[PDB]
Amino acid sequence: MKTGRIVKSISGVYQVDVNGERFNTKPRGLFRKKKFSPVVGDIVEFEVQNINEGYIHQVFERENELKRPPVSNIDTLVIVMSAVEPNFSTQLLDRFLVIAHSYQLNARILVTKKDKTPIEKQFEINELLKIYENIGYETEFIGNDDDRKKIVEAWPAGLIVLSGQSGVGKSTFLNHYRPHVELFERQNGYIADTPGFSALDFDHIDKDEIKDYFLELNRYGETCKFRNCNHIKEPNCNVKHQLEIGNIAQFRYDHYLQLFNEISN
Amino acid sequence: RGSHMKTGRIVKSISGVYQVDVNGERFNTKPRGLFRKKKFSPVVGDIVEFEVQNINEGYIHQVFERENELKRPPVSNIDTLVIVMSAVEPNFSTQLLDRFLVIAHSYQLNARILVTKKDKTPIEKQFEINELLKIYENIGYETEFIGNDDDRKKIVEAWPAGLIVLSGQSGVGKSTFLNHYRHVELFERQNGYIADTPGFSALDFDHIDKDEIKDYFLELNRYGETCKFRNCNHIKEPNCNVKHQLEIGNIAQFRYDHYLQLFNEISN
Ligand SMILES: [Zn+2]
Ligand SMILES: [Zn+2]
């Protein structure tokens, strides 16, 4: 028996990587079901046959997954934002982070097009990224002067998936590895060759979960007077309080309220 | 207005006054003479009978025989020792966990296993760890694997009734469980109490003989019953059921390996 990640799917043959060695595996004889469809990202236990073939015994229960593209067990969603063309937007970035955590994904932030960004504007984005760093995210600000392969190689261990709108430069990263979805090797893991549905979407989300996905509202929410305080019109609200003494950025709370209202309608 | 003689647990010990919890009510008790005359040696966790004096104080009558204890810190009558290990920072070690379980059972403590930092752990490593925890489960331990997402107060509340002591080394996430509650003190929870402790160490080559080690590998204990050899240490003895169960996969190699290393280490 061997364990590894499915990196490639084609006509019901699943290619599992085990310590850099590829095995062309299939489902064992019995399996056809609603719970019988492996995806790229799946961790499987398989029995070796014919040197580099095998028969999948179990698919481990997925920690997470996306439907478009179909990919499971994502270790880090990199949210890719351009500094210009279009302008860096905390409204958009806050939306993306919320959707990331709605799918249970760890996220980090990558800003592109530094070399096309006026330095005064660069310094504005820097102070904004420090508020995201306060909240708990890793942030990077790059342009054409930075080695993209080494950026990708240095990201945390495991499966990287890139997410972000068209034209932010995701393919500039994905073409150091590439030329449906396939995983490619990094020194300490993998990267998917297809972005996470680009401008990512929420799937099902209720108005009461949004505060969970603002990680600082989540934290500061723990002592709000009301049990399930939405931090909107509740008295004795510690989010309102931490906002008032400046440990929550106003744009974060503004975006929270906008999204809360959007989801209710 | 209540009864005269009461039984409960010492939750706090400060300068010769022993605070005793009787059904959620605290009584500050001591021996009924000069503190000098050293009559009782009570420890946090002790079950004691006292006579009620001046409303919410008392005279200790009797400390019941300890079912178990630690000397460091000094705490008796532990219902569950929770061994807290990180998945990462530092890396999960079946070597260290096996050692901790041996110390635990050497003090006749029931143990369970808590792994932290799931959220900092690459998913492929998480599944490796889930696969190792299933082996400890087959051996008969309760196991949990948590990160930041999980509700601590809730987990710490859902553990078996009575006194929980968390044990594990520096920087593993233990402080985080206790902050929903706050030498040593017990804090009330629904269904019992909880306390802290800084992990084990010089407790192996402290009171354990080479011949006891196999008692505290719970599956070696159980399989050892039908070894032909008297006092079988499962090393080179023939007609060894441990060696046999191992050969057919009922004992994990890493368990037998850790047993062998520890045995050789205590032969010094
Ligand atoms: Zn609130
Ligand atoms: Zn034996």
Author numbering:
A (entry chain A): 1 to 179, 201 to 286
B (entry chain B): -3 to 178, 201 to 286
From the paper:
One class of assembly cofactors are the ribosome-associated GTPases (RA-GTPases), a subset of P-loop GTPases within the TRAnslation FACtor associated (TRAFAC) family, of which the proteins RsgA, RbgA, Era, and HflX are members. RsgA is a nonessential, highly conserved late-stage 30S assembly cofactor that has been implicated in the docking of helix 44 (h44) of the 16S rRNA into the correct conformation and therefore correct maturation of the decoding center prior to subunit joining. The overall structure of RsgA consists of three domains: the N-terminal OB-fold, the central GTPase domain, and a C-terminal ZNF. Both the OB-fold and the ZNF domains are involved in nucleotide recognition and target RsgA to the 30S ribosomal subunit, where they contact major helices of the 16S rRNA.
